C-alpha cells in the first residue's frame, strides 16, 4: 500500500513532465499554423447571404395549391393545406419589393445570421503552414482595403451641374496632368455624360406630380430596371396613391371643419 | 518571426540539457554504487 502510493506519485510527476514538454511541442507549431486563404471569402469562411441580402426577413408565398374537388380557393383552405404541406411554399427575396407585404420570416440559407459560410473551403484544408500571420504583410492590408470601394456617391450626386461637370470632368485633368484633350475625347465625354443624365432628368420631371405622371413613371421603369426597382419616388400601386391622396384632401377638409368649429364654443 | 520563434527553442534546449545532465549524473552514480556493491563481495576482502 505505501509503495504503490510512492510509485504512482513518482510516476505522476514524470507524466506531468512529459505532458508539459508536449504542450510546448505543440505550442511551437501553434504559431506557424494559419487559416487557409480563399478567394470567395478571403479565408473568413463567411460571405453576406445574397439571397436575403443580409436582412434575413425574406418574404414567403404560396405558389400552387392542390385544391380538393368540391372546394373554393379561400384563405382558410390554403392555411389547412399549409398544415399538411399540400401547397408549394416558396421564398421570395426582400430585395424584390411587392405591392402586398408578404410574411417576412427568417432566411433558411443563413439561419437568420445573414451570411453563408464558404462551402468551397473544406475541413481537410482549413489550415495552412505559412508563418505569414506573424509578419503582417502589405498585401493582406491592401487586399482587405481593396474591397472598401472608396464610395464615390458624394460626388456623383453633386456632379449634376453643367459648370461643375465641366470642372470635374475636363478642367481638373487638364490642369493636374498637364495635357490637353482631343476634340473627339471631349465630345465623347460630353455625349456620354448627357446620355447618363437622362435618368435624373426623368426622375426630376416625374417628381413634379404633374398630371399624366404615370406615363413618365412607366418610362422610368422601362429605361433602367434595376435602379427603378429601388427608387422611392416611383409608387408600386398607382390607384393606391391616387385614392389615398384624394382621401387625404377630404381628411384635411374635415380637419379644417373640426379646427374651425372648435373655436365657436368658448365665447 | 526569428525573435518570436527563439524562446521556445531556447527553453526546450534548456529542458534537453537539464535532462541530459540529470541522466548522466544518475548513470555515473548508479555505476559507482553497483560496482561498490559488487566490490564488497567479490574483490579484496573489504571494509
Amino acid at each position: 500500500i505505501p509503495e504503490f502510493i510512492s510509485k504512482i506519485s513518482y510516476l505522476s510527476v514524470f507524466a506531468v513532465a512529459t505532458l508539459g514538454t508536449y504542450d510546448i511541442a505543440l505550442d511551437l507549431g501553434k504559431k506557424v499554423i494559419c487559416q487557409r486563404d480563399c478567394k470567395t471569402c478571403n479565408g473568413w469562411q463567411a460571405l453576406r447571404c445574397t439571397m436575403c441580402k443580409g436582412t434575413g426577413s425574406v418574404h414567403y408565398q404560396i405558389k400552387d395549391y392542390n385544391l380538393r374537388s368540391g372546394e373554393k380557393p379561400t384563405a382558410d383552405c390554403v392555411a389547412d393545406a399549409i398544415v399538411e404541406n399540400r401547397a408549394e411554399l416558396v421564398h421570395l427575396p426582400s430585395s424584390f419589393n411587392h405591392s402586398a407585404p408578404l410574411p417576412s420570416k427568417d432566411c433558411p440559407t443563413c439561419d437568420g445570421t445573414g451570411a453563408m459560410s464558404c462551402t468551397e473551403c473544406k475541413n481537410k484544408l482549413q489550415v495552412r503552414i505559412s508563418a505569414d500571420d506573424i509578419m503582417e504583410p502589405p498585401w493582406k492590408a491592401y487586399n482587405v482595403l481593396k474591397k472598401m470601394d472608396y464610395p464615390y456617391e458624394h460626388i456623383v450626386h453633386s456632379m449634376k451641374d453643367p459648370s461643375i461637370a465641366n470642372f470635374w470632368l475636363i478642367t481638373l485633368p487638364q490642369i493636374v496632368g498637364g495635357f490637353d484633350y482631343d476634340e473627339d475625347v471631349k465630345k465623347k465625354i460630353w455625349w456620354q455624360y448627357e446620355e447618363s443624365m437622362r435618368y435624373d432628368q426623368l426622375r426630376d420631371l416625374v417628381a413634379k406630380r404633374n398630371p399624366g405622371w404615370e406615363y413618365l413613371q412607366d418610362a422610368l421603369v422601362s429605361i433602367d430596371p434595376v435602379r427603378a426597382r429601388e427608387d422611392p419616388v416611383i409608387v408600386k400601386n398607382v390607384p393606391y396613391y391616387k385614392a389615398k391622396k384624394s382621401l387625404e384632401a377630404e381628411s384635411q377638409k374635415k380637419a379644417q371643419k373640426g379646427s374651425r368649429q372648435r373655436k365657436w364654443w368658448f365665447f | 518571426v526569428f525573435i518570436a520563434l527563439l524562446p521556445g527553442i531556447l527553453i526546450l534546449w534548456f529542458i534537453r540539457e537539464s535532462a541530459m545532465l540529470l541522466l548522466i549524473t544518475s548513470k555515473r552514480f548508479l555505476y559507482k554504487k553497483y560496482n561498490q556493491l559488487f566490490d564488497m563481495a567479490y574483490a579484496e576482502n573489504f571494509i
Partner: peptide
Amino acid sequence: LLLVAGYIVRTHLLFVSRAYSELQTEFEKI
C-alpha cells in the same frame, strides 16, 4: 528558417522523451 526550426524541434523532442524515459527507469532502479 521554419524548416530548420522544425528539424531542431524534432531532435529536441526525441532527446527529451528518451532522456525522461531513461531517467524514470533509472530512478526506479533506486
